[PDB]
Amino acid sequence: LPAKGDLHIPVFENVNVRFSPDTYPDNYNEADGTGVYHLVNGRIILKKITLPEYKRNVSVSLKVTLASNGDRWDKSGSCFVLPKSSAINLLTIARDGMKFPSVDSLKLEKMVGIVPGKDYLPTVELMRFMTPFGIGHYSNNNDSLSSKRRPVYIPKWESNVTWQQDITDLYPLLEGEAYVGIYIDTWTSEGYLVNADIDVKESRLACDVLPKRHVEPLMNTVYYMGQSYPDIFARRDVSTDFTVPKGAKNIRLKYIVTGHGGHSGGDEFVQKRNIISVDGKEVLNFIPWRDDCASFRRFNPATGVWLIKRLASYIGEKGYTEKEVEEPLASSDLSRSNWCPGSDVVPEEAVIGTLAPGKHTFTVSIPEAQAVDGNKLNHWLVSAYLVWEE
Amino acid sequence: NLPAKGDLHIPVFENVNVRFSPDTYPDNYNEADGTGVYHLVNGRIILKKITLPEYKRNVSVSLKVTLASNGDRWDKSGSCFVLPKSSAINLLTIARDGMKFPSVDSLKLEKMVGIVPGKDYLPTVELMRFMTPFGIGHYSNNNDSLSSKRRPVYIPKWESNVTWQQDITDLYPLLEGEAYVGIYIDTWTSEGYLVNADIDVKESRLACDVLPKRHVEPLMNTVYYMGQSYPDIFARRDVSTDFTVPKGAKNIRLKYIVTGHGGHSGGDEFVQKRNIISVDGKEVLNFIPWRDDCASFRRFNPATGVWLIKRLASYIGEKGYTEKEVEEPLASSDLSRSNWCPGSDVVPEEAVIGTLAPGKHTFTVSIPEAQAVDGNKLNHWLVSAYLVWEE
Ligand SMILES: [Cl-]
Ligand SMILES: [Cl-]
Ligand SMILES: [Cl-]
Ligand SMILES: [Cl-]
Ligand SMILES: [Cl-]
Ligand SMILES: [Cl-]
C-alpha cells in the first residue's frame, strides 16, 4: 500500500466566534477570504477540509485552542463534522433552504434536528467543550486588577485553554471532502477567539491497511440552528431506530453528555442519572458529574465569587490554631453535570460487539431532568453515535 | 509472519508498604518474602524480579503506580526504577553482596557516589519520578466532623488515593529478559505508604510490525537511594560524564528528569533555577523546571499545612458586587515548586539529538545558581538522565 504522508490541517486560525448581525446579517454568509463560513450571525464557523485518499491506516487528533475576546461567560461549545449521507445538514439548511425534517410532536415535541429523519442524520461532534469565564481577555496578571479577583493560591491566570482528543474513529466522516465547524453559544459581539488543527499520522507500515470503518449518527440535542433548549427528558425518553447491516464488527457506542441550567438547583449543578439503551437493554448507566472543578481555577479570571464562612485550621504565630474565616468560592469551583468551565468532554464508551442485522432501537433517558421554567433554562446536551468495522 | 506473544500484565507490587522499620527490616538487605518482594534500606526501597518475553512484534509498555499514605503525613520524594543491564554494581548487589559504588574523583564529584557511571557501574534508571501528596488516604476521611477545618469550601471531597501512569516503551530494553524493578520513597516513618505498581505490555496485532532493536544509555541519577547524600553539588560545579556511541545509532533522544528541593522559605524547592544541559559542550536543553498549577492538586492533599493570607477580595454580597478584606487559606500544597506538586509525577523532558559521531561524547548538567546545603536547609536537585536510540 502506497504512502500519502502525514497531514497537518490548520482548520481555523484566530477566528472570532461571535454574535453580530451587523457583520453577518443572515443565517448563511459566503465564505470569507480565508475560506471560513460564518453562519447563524457568527455563532457557527465552518470550513471545507480535504484529506488524501489514504490506503494505509491512520490516526487523527483534534486540537482546539480558545480564548475570550470579551465575552465573560462559560458558554457551551461544540466542534463538529457534517455527516456524509445526509442531504439535510447545517450548511444546506442555511444556504439552500433545507429544513430539519418534521417530527411527531407526541414523541419528540418541537425538538427538530436531534434524531435522524428523512434525508437527515444528526450533526456529529468531534469535541464538546465549555468555555471558561473570560480567559485571555480578562487574564490580566498585573497587580492592579489581579489581587481583587485572583486567589492567593493561584499565582497567575492562564491566557488561553487548549484541548486535544483522538478522533481516529470519526475518520469515515473526514474522508474525501468534509465540512468541519465550531459552534459557541455566544450572544456577545466580542465573542471568542479559537484555533483548531486536525493532524493525521500515516502508518509507516506497507502492510497496515486502513480498515473499512463506519460511523452511525444517533442523536445530537445541541441547539445549533433554529433549535430549542433540550429539556424533553424532563417529560419523556428520547428514542431513535437505526439499521445495522450484515457483517458489522466491533460495534461501540460513544456518548457525549453535559447537563445545564445555571440557576441554583438547575441541572448544571445537580446530579441526574442518564440511562442509555439499545433494544431496551441498558448499555450505559451513570451520573454525569465532576467534583474537581476547583482544579480549573486558573483558567477562570472573570468568574463570579461568593464568600463562605468556615472554621479553618491554620499555622499561626504560636503554632497550630483555629479561626473562622470568610473563604472565597468561585462559580468555576462548583461541581457540575460532567463539565467545568474550561474543560472538554471525553465521550463515554460502551462495547456492543455485534448486533442482529436489521432494525434496532436506541434510547436515552434522563428521567429526573428538570423542565425549562421561565428563565430557568434546564437542559441536556446529548450526542451519540455508533462506530464499527464492515 | 512474526509470532504473537500476546498482551502481558505484570502486577509488580500489590499493597506493599514502603516504610522505615528497623524492627521489621533490620538490615539494608532483607530476604524476599513469599511474594518475591525484597525490602531494602530498612523498608524504604522495595524491589522485585520481573521478566519480559523476547518480543518479536513491536509493543507499547506502560507503568501504573497507585499510592496512598499509611500514616506518613509528608510530601516525600519517590522514584520507581529499574536496575540497568550491564552493571555488576547496583542497589541489590551493593546491599546483598557487599559491593560498593565506585570511588570518585573528589575534585570533580566531591562525595557524590553513585550519580554518574564508573567502573562496573551504570546509574539506576528511573521509570517514574513522583512526589507523594500530603497524607492521602490515611487522612482522607470525608465524613469526619473535624474535616471541614482542613478542607476548603471549593474542594467537595478528598481523594482517597493517587494514580500515575506513564508510557515507558523506550525503556523496554532495560526490561527484556530478567530485570529488577523497584520503588523508593524517602520516608522516615514506620507507617510509610502503600503502593501498587503494574507494568502492562500491549502487543501489535500486525504480523509485520517488527520490534525495533533499541538501547538505553544511563547517564546520571542523583537520587539518594542507598548510602548517598543530598545532591547539592550543582551549587559549586557542573557534573559531567563521558559515554560511548556505536556506529549506526539512529534517532538518539535524551530524557531528563529533574526536580528541585529544599523545603524551607527561599529553598530550591520554591525558587526558580535555570538548568543548562549539554552534549559535547553544546546546549540541548535549557529551561527553568517549574510548575505554577499546584493548587490544581488540592483534593489530593488532606494533611497539608495551611496559612491565612489577607487579601482584599471582590465578591457577590447580599446587595450586589462588593469588596472586603478576607483571610484566605493558602496550603503548602498550593505553592509553586521546581517542577512538581505534592501528588504529581514528572514527565521527562526530551531532546532530539539525532546522530552522533561514533566514539566518546560528553554529557553535562549545570544548574549554576543552585544553593548549597546549609545546616538544616537541605537544598538539592534530583536529576536523572538517559539517552535512547535504535540500532
Ligand atoms: Cl459579557
Ligand atoms: Cl409540543
Ligand atoms: Cl505588576
Ligand atoms: Cl508523619
Ligand atoms: Cl569533597
Ligand atoms: Cl507543611
CSV table of N, CA, C and O in Angstrom, one decimal, chain B residues 52 79 88 94 197 303 348 379:
chain,number,residue,atom,x,y,z
B,52,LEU,N,10.3,-10.0,31.1
B,52,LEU,CA,9.5,-9.8,29.8
B,52,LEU,C,10.1,-10.8,28.8
B,52,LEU,O,11.2,-11.0,28.7
B,79,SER,N,10.8,7.4,43.7
B,79,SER,CA,11.3,7.0,42.4
B,79,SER,C,11.0,5.6,42.1
B,79,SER,O,11.5,4.7,42.9
B,88,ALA,N,27.4,-4.7,37.1
B,88,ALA,CA,27.6,-5.6,38.2
B,88,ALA,C,27.2,-4.9,39.5
B,88,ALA,O,26.6,-5.5,40.4
B,94,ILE,N,24.9,-4.1,45.9
B,94,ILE,CA,25.5,-3.3,47.0
B,94,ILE,C,25.0,-3.8,48.3
B,94,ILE,O,25.8,-4.1,49.2
B,197,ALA,N,2.0,-1.3,41.8
B,197,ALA,CA,2.7,-1.0,40.6
B,197,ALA,C,2.4,-2.1,39.5
B,197,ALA,O,2.6,-3.2,39.8
B,303,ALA,N,-3.5,16.4,54.4
B,303,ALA,CA,-2.7,16.7,55.5
B,303,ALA,C,-1.7,17.9,55.3
B,303,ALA,O,-0.7,18.0,56.0
B,348,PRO,N,9.4,13.1,31.8
B,348,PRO,CA,10.7,13.5,31.4
B,348,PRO,C,10.7,14.5,30.3
B,348,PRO,O,9.9,14.4,29.3
B,379,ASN,N,18.9,22.0,50.5
B,379,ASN,CA,18.8,22.3,49.0
B,379,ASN,C,19.5,21.2,48.3
B,379,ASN,O,20.6,20.7,48.7
